[PDB]
Scaffold this active site. Sequence first.
Site, PDB file in Angstrom:
ATOM      1  N   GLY A 158      62.190  68.419  24.405  1.00 52.51           N
ATOM      2  CA  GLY A 158      61.097  67.489  24.710  1.00 52.51           C
ATOM      3  C   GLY A 158      60.812  67.162  26.031  1.00 52.51           C
ATOM      4  O   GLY A 158      62.054  66.984  26.815  1.00 52.51           O
ATOM      5  N   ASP A 159      59.577  66.927  26.568  1.00 51.15           N
ATOM      6  CA  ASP A 159      59.366  65.845  27.826  1.00 51.15           C
ATOM      7  C   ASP A 159      60.184  64.608  27.671  1.00 51.15           C
ATOM      8  O   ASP A 159      60.099  64.026  26.397  1.00 51.15           O
ATOM      9  CB  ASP A 159      58.254  66.108  28.058  1.00 51.15           C
ATOM     10  CG  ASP A 159      57.702  65.667  29.449  1.00 51.15           C
ATOM     11  OD1 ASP A 159      56.432  65.703  29.851  1.00 51.15           O
ATOM     12  OD2 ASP A 159      58.574  65.435  30.465  1.00 51.15           O
ATOM     13  N   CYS A 160      60.952  64.127  28.704  1.00 53.18           N
ATOM     14  CA  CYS A 160      61.423  62.925  28.476  1.00 53.18           C
ATOM     15  C   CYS A 160      60.714  61.872  27.987  1.00 53.18           C
ATOM     16  O   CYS A 160      59.777  61.131  28.769  1.00 53.18           O
ATOM     17  CB  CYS A 160      61.975  62.639  29.923  1.00 53.18           C
ATOM     18  SG  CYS A 160      63.197  64.013  30.607  1.00 53.18           S
TER      19      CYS A 160
END
Lengths: 770, 769
Positions: B288-290
């Site tokens: 996932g993107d942060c």
Amino acid sequence: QANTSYTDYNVEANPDLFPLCLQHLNASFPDCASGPLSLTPVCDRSLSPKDRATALVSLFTFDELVNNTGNTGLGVSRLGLPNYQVWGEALHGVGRANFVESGNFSWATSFPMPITMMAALNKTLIHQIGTIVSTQLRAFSNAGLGGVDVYSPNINTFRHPVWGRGQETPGEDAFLTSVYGYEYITALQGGVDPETLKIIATAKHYAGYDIESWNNHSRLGNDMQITQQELSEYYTPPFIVASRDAKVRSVMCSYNAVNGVPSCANKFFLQTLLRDTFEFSEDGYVSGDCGAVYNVWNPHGYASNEAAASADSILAGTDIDCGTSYQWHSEDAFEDSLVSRSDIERGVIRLYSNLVQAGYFDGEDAPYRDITWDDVLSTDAWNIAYEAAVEGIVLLKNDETLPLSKDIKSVAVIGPWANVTEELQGNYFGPAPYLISPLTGFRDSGLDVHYALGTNLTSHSTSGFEEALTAAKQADAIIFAGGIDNTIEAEAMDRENITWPGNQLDLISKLSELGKPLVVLQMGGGQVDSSSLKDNDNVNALIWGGYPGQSGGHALADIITGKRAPAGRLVTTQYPAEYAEVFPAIDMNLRPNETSGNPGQTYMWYTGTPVYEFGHGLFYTTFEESTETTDAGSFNIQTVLTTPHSGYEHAQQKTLLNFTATVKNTGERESDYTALVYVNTTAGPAPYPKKWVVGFDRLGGLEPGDSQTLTVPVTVESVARTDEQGNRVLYPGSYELALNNERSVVVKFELKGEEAVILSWPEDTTSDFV
Amino acid sequence: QANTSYTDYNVEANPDLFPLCLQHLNASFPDCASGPLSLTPVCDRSLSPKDRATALVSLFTFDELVNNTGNTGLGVSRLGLPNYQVWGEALHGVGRANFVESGNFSWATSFPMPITMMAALNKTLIHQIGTIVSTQLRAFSNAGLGGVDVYSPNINTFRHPVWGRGQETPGEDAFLTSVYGYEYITALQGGVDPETLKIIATAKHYAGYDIESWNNHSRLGNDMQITQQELSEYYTPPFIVASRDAKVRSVMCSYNAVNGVPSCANKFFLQTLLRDTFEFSEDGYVSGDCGAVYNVWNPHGYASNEAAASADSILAGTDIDCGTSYQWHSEDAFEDSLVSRSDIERGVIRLYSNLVQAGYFDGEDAPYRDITWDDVLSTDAWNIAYEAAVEGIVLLKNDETLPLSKDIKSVAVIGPWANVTEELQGNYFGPAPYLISPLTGFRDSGLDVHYALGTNLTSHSTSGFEEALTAAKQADAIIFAGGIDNTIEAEAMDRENITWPGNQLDLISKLSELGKPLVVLQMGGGQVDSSSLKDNDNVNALIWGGYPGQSGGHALADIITGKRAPAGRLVTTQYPAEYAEVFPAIDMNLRPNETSGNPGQTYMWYTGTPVYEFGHGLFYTTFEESTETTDAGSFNIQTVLTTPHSGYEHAQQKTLLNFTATVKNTGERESDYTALVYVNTTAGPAPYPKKWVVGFDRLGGLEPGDSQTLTVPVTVESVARTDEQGNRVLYPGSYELALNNERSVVVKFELKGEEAVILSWPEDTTSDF
Ligand SMILES: *[C@@H]1O[C@H](CO)[C@@H](O[C@@H]2O[C@H](CO)[C@@H](O[C@@H]3O[C@H](CO[C@H]4O[C@H](CO[C@H]5O[C@H](CO)[C@@H](O)[C@H](O)[C@@H]5O[C@H]5O[C@H](CO)[C@@H](O)[C@H](O)[C@@H]5O)[C@@H](O)[C@H](O[C@H]5O[C@H](CO)[C@@H](O)[C@H](O)[C@@H]5O)[C@@H]4O)[C@@H](O)[C@H](O[C@H]4O[C@H](CO)[C@@H](O)[C@H](O)[C@@H]4O[C@H]4O[C@H](CO)[C@@H](O)[C@H](O)[C@@H]4O)[C@@H]3O)[C@H](O)[C@H]2NC(C)=O)[C@H](O)[C@H]1NC(C)=O
Ligand SMILES: *[C@@H]1O[C@H](CO)[C@@H](O[C@@H]2O[C@H](CO)[C@@H](O)[C@H](O)[C@H]2NC(C)=O)[C@H](O)[C@H]1NC(C)=O
Ligand SMILES: *[C@@H]1O[C@H](CO)[C@@H](O)[C@H](O)[C@H]1NC(C)=O
Ligand SMILES: *[C@@H]1O[C@H](CO)[C@@H](O)[C@H](O)[C@H]1NC(C)=O
Ligand SMILES: *[C@@H]1O[C@H](CO)[C@@H](O)[C@H](O)[C@H]1NC(C)=O
Ligand SMILES: *[C@@H]1O[C@H](CO)[C@@H](O)[C@H](O)[C@H]1NC(C)=O
Ligand SMILES: *[C@@H]1O[C@H](CO)[C@@H](O)[C@H](O)[C@H]1NC(C)=O
Ligand SMILES: *[C@@H]1O[C@H](CO)[C@@H](O)[C@H](O)[C@H]1NC(C)=O
Ligand SMILES: *[C@@H]1O[C@H](CO)[C@@H](O)[C@H](O)[C@H]1NC(C)=O
Ligand SMILES: *[C@@H]1O[C@H](CO)[C@@H](O)[C@H](O)[C@H]1NC(C)=O
Ligand SMILES: *[C@@H]1O[C@H](CO)[C@@H](O)[C@H](O)[C@H]1NC(C)=O
Ligand SMILES: *[C@@H]1O[C@H](CO)[C@@H](O)[C@H](O)[C@H]1NC(C)=O
Ligand SMILES: *[C@@H]1O[C@H](CO)[C@@H](O)[C@H](O)[C@H]1NC(C)=O
Ligand SMILES: *[C@@H]1O[C@H](CO)[C@@H](O)[C@H](O)[C@H]1NC(C)=O
Ligand SMILES: *[C@@H]1O[C@H](CO)[C@@H](O)[C@H](O)[C@H]1NC(C)=O
Ligand SMILES: *[C@@H]1O[C@H](CO)[C@@H](O)[C@H](O)[C@H]1NC(C)=O
Ligand SMILES: *[C@@H]1O[C@H](CO)[C@@H](O)[C@H](O)[C@H]1NC(C)=O
Ligand SMILES: *[C@@H]1O[C@H](CO)[C@@H](O)[C@H](O)[C@H]1NC(C)=O
Ligand SMILES: *[C@@H]1O[C@H](CO)[C@@H](O)[C@H](O)[C@H]1NC(C)=O
Ligand SMILES: *[C@@H]1O[C@H](CO)[C@@H](O)[C@H](O)[C@H]1NC(C)=O
């Protein structure tokens, strides 16, 4: 498809396969020493099977590729790639090799039918036979007489007792059927995902297939309504186990539809479940049942022609067509923009990934390439087929009559099953080295034999009664061999009732009133209503002998004369006649529904009275059964699930507790002992099963006096139930482990905690999409 | 999430990450010779990576497992399994290593941004840069200063010109962006599915992500509506190539929703496309993107809380959460039976499969374990950062004023980009060994320099104007250094216009009225409307410098003095300013729609008039271009797809034909030559693209009178279009391959036969369920 007049496959249960599909092929191996491929990557032993297979298919013209999308793979003469036949069979021995008329490779060992192999409740027995079949299969391959892949095993369950093919299965229990699959597949393939595949195995039939034709409900056009709950809890576990644990390299998709969709065009079955949930090997391939791709069109009408049925089956995940749909329509499908060349290639690359992994491109020094006719002789000479029959024969009833007295010097053998040949082999059998009828058993056991046919299997004439009665008087004791065979139960032929056929019963009756020792052999795979033989004190003994294979008669005779003792047990319910009358056999709903007429199906749900119960067996001795810890106490579900699971891929694979007991021989005779450990519970939602198997063992060679300790691991997954969405779930509550049906020994336990999902059931978004 | 007051993440574009997520970790290696694991199968080199990772995860308690489901893997002290940081960066050099204050490992080579790197049209250079970054990254790893995985590259396309992060991409074209991706990933990972992973690469951001905040439309809550056709044709091909061809081991799912579904909760995207259509490695993991997993709940509202957001993302195929969603809410999800243990272990096994194949468990002797600070020094010594800047600078306007005439011995260096440090580095950059301003560029070049700031980048003030004009008059030539920087365009900050900021143009104009030779430098990633500079004949020359990195100064001066000749070309359109006014930037529809005000997006569809064009660029010389055969003739679609395809996984990977020209230097100065080869057709459905890139190349050192063969493989797949359902289809009809925007060379060919599907596009049954 090759019908010569109008055929309705909604009613007809046998497809008309084109000769190309049915053509046996001459096996050879490609040449990586000097053939056209030697200098290409397929012959590079440092690349993955998938890279080698992918490089291979890259060389084909489209015309050559399509010639190899069917079971009768015609090869590619241009690259020195031989023709290859995917359609091999090993249900209970080599079934579909290119048998020579006589001499070398004119026969292979014919073991008992699986229904009888399972009855032994010896998981090692099933393994050992697989290893023997696997070796004989390789001998045939190495003499250019077969492939290295077989359409075995049948790990469907004998759900409804009419099924004409229930004889091919390890019975009506998913747990036993799962273990059967694991032991046979691991034996066939030569280990658990091993460096070299011995024989590529195929779990069939995926899924919801357990009816041929009952009341003209043809398997080829059947659409079975199954709940996600029952699909998850009953119809698929054996496949989950074959795919996830046995690492089976192939699955055959069934002829039937489930919830509107034919198995071979069923995205949910092949992609969402088998591939995305049951961890089917990355390189594993799906084979259609012979004609099943055609059936997506005729008569399911899911696709409007054979070209769309081919496209729908390829896009869903059917890699190889047993048939001629791919070979003769995948080009039309491509030209109509229904599939890409890459789509059609995916199936062939997968097939050849497995052949590469079987040493197919690796020359004469490869593993298993050194197996000869002499290995068939030597493996047959172990007489494991005799042993298998001796362990798998079930004593249903006995009053001291068996074994036969010192006094009995002569015996009358009567009935349609006394003088038999291929009746011993059930179905999916090859030429056997011999066939010992029960008659030939008793002649060889050295009692004076007096034969009388008496009646044919399905007769209403008394013509033969006179001659049989008079032979019975002569002699000291009566062996009546009757039951059913493949004239009653076979592929494309379900029973219409579950009663003894013809007048066999009428004859057994007359033989009862002669003050003579009367032994009945009930043969066949399916069970027959023996109620009348149950409550008739003159019928002394009753044996279910199923389909005991090449040495069946030596086995039955030797059980009867007490040269060996029986320990086998039923692996299906013997239901009363009325069961087959009161609700349709194509109702898949296992749970009792009074409104519909369903009394509940299998030992797990049946609310009527079996004549003889799932698990029922007897011995020529008596057993004292008991245990140290009769309450194994509480376990926290969150605790069990959140500790390390060193050695297991999955937390739920761990032993929750052992079931232990002591078992002392307290009777006349030495013998083996079999156990089936059940669970029951009020844990989870209603309705509640009555019980369900979670393990089984066979102890060996208990002399009188002797005790042996029975130790059966109850794994965490084995006691989980299943919710209305199909998730496998540990529920908290009260549990009982009972030994055999008599509940000899009871170990109680409580699951403490909250509910935990151990398997998430994906949603089916594809079956009914618009 | 870690906001100390209400924060509306539908408008705010930066997540408030908890510190555990932002924590740097002291890297180390597990000990398979002596540690707890030595006796276990994870330490057995006979077994596959998947069987080893699986055995490892089988030893954990659940708590230990849950602690290793986020980017900040806290490790397992009980087994001597170190903490492991999944969050590395290598956009254009080492970006998130544990840099030391000074000495060894206090910097890494900082290459030009990808947007300039690409403008070189030299795929070999992209590959070589990636090999250097890989080597430097492994040097940091060996020193305990970083992981062996990086959240690179960015292979989103610079679709709309207001995008704050277009600077990070190889521009607006899917072909160029694919090739960039292939070369960068294969360089990072140390080959094509190699025996030992050098650095695990992560194609981002998947998918439909090309806006930060335009009009308060926050990436974190944006629900983008994309047609299956354009999803298949434009928005996913770079990810297809990364997955299928480069064999990328990781893919980052984007913050945004597409057609109602956040990417990290998108089963269609992660399972049906990426895993079931794009042949993503069977051991590949999705990061996932942060914050992305949190965003599935707040603010998308796809899940109703963070446990449900975590469950929904694990079951879609998000293996590793950059964030604390999994680490802190997995247990709640398991105890509320939204996921099995096995679901939560699936992601960690995938990650550790990759670390096993990177040699993470095989001790001090494994490949890449011998790389040291020494290896950083030598790779930086090669000066590919400088070479890259020189090849990537694009000359837009010129009237012979450039190169600088031997006469001109003094120069007035003016503008806000003249005196710079970290502006040279765009974003996602670590400390540089040095930073060379344009100003430092000219001082070193030997010319006498007259520096004047003139004006600040964004400014309502005329304060410094007079001082600058003076500097100019008191010198032979004027170099203006201007444009945009990360104060205009950055992560979480789109532009609201595509025009020069402040009063740079007003000042540039006044500088032109002094009839001295005037060279202008348009810097930054985003293009800016220079129509006023085009039409002003007194603006001699106009250069686009992008973000040219540690050596940008020496690159720009050497171009301007003529120590080097330019060859680069724009990899985005320079639109007129009205482009950012007529239609909302959140419209993903590439085809023109007159009802909505949409003129069509990118060079492929734009009906308007670019100020300068995708592919536009000039040389310090003239080129003569010709080919023997201008009619390649007929190809039967069925014939081309039905022959063998030895060497290729898929038939469509085959060369349909070679585009082939002769190129002669008919001028006074030696030059590199750059070609873009475009296709256009009347085949397939309407509307018709203007054209689309099917190939490119760059030829080296053409001396005057020299000729060279240009040979560009045109693949069967590169000329396939896409039907209304998203299928990749070869259409029969008339095709033309044109050389550069002026079409100096046109080769005709005809596709005969029936429509063939080359890629079956699966139906989305899960998004709307
Ligand atoms: C549950 O089911 C169990 C499984 O079926 C069952 O166990 C088996 O019992 C049977 C019947 O009692 C035993 O059968 C006898 O075996 C003798 C030969 O034994 C040796 O070789 C056996 C087979 O070995 C292969 O398979 C193994 C099992 O997988 C492998 O691990 C081996 O490596 C080997 O594989 C090879 O071949 C495979 C197939 O081709 C191939 O995959 C592989 O690559 C490789 O090529 C072994 O199992 C056996 O091991 C037992 O004993 C040794 C000690 O010797 C122990 O260490 C082991 O732990 C194990 O207990 C041996 O190594 C035969 O001699 C014998 O035949 C003779 O007698 C029969 C009567 O039954 C006659 O019909 C027959 O014609 C023979 O007569 C001839 O010789 C005799 C000599 O005495 C002479 O009197 C006569 O005149 C004539 O000349 C018979 O077949 C079988 O061995 C058991 N196997 C196993 C593994 O268990 C178990 O009992 C059941 N349990 C319960 C509770 O029911
Ligand atoms: C490809 O694009 C060129 C434009 O570069 C098209 O050229 C036009 O062709 C027609 C007839 O051939 C001429 O009368 C026009 O003058 C051309 N216009 C321009 C602006 O050059 C060509 O038609 C396109 N080809 C296909 C196959 O669509
Ligand atoms: C075969 O049977 C099908 C119906 O299933 C029918 O459509 C077809 O005409 C038959 N073919 C022949 C040759 O009789
Ligand atoms: C297989 O070999 C036999 C014996 O030589 C030959 O007669 C037969 O035609 C061959 N079979 C096929 C299907 O070609
Ligand atoms: C495909 O098989 C047929 C026989 O069913 C055969 O005649 C034909 O030659 C094969 N085609 C090719 C191209 O090899
Ligand atoms: C048959 O097999 C036996 C092995 O027992 C071998 O001796 C013989 O050579 C074979 N015969 C032929 C004709 O191949
Ligand atoms: C038994 O069956 C065989 C084989 O089918 C048959 O030839 C024989 O006549 C039968 N009768 C007796 C008494 O064995
Ligand atoms: C049994 O069937 C056989 C074969 O049809 C027949 O010849 C025989 O006479 C029958 N016997 C009796 C007793 O009906
Ligand atoms: C029980 O049977 C009735 C009638 O067949 C049916 O409507 C009802 O839904 C059934 N219940 C279940 C659980 O299938
Ligand atoms: C169960 O029994 C096996 C076999 O004896 C033993 O190895 C194991 O320790 C026991 N496990 C439990 C949970 O009691
Ligand atoms: C299980 O069944 C036994 C008898 O079969 C019964 O007496 C007992 O209450 C049941 N236990 C549970 C936990 O349901
Ligand atoms: C953080 O922002 C969220 C919504 O974006 C809000 O619900 C929450 O109360 C905020 N937290 C604090 C401490 O203000
Ligand atoms: C990393 O190592 C340094 C130096 O020993 C230490 O100060 C720091 O606390 C460590 N970091 C973590 C996150 O434990
Ligand atoms: C999980 O991480 C926390 C720190 O955020 C730490 O206190 C704890 O030790 C870890 N738990 C285990 C079981 O290692
Ligand atoms: C964006 O939101 C701000 C407040 O966050 C508001 O004042 C402004 O008007 C909005 N801007 C645009 C261009 O919609
Ligand atoms: C720094 O790197 C140099 C490279 O030659 C090396 O000699 C030196 O030992 C390193 N310094 C430290 C303090 O590690
Ligand atoms: C450039 O700017 C820096 C501060 O950013 C300043 O210290 C330096 O002196 C400037 N150089 C000139 C020549 O003005
Ligand atoms: C430019 O900005 C800097 C820093 O804000 C300031 O020192 C200077 O006064 C400004 N110069 C002009 C000409 O506006
Ligand atoms: C064009 O835009 C209008 C205005 O919103 C919209 O109604 C229509 O769907 C669009 N047409 C296409 C082809 O997307
Ligand atoms: C195309 O050009 C390449 C470029 O090196 C050449 O090697 C290849 O053989 C050519 N193939 C065709 C089909 O023109």
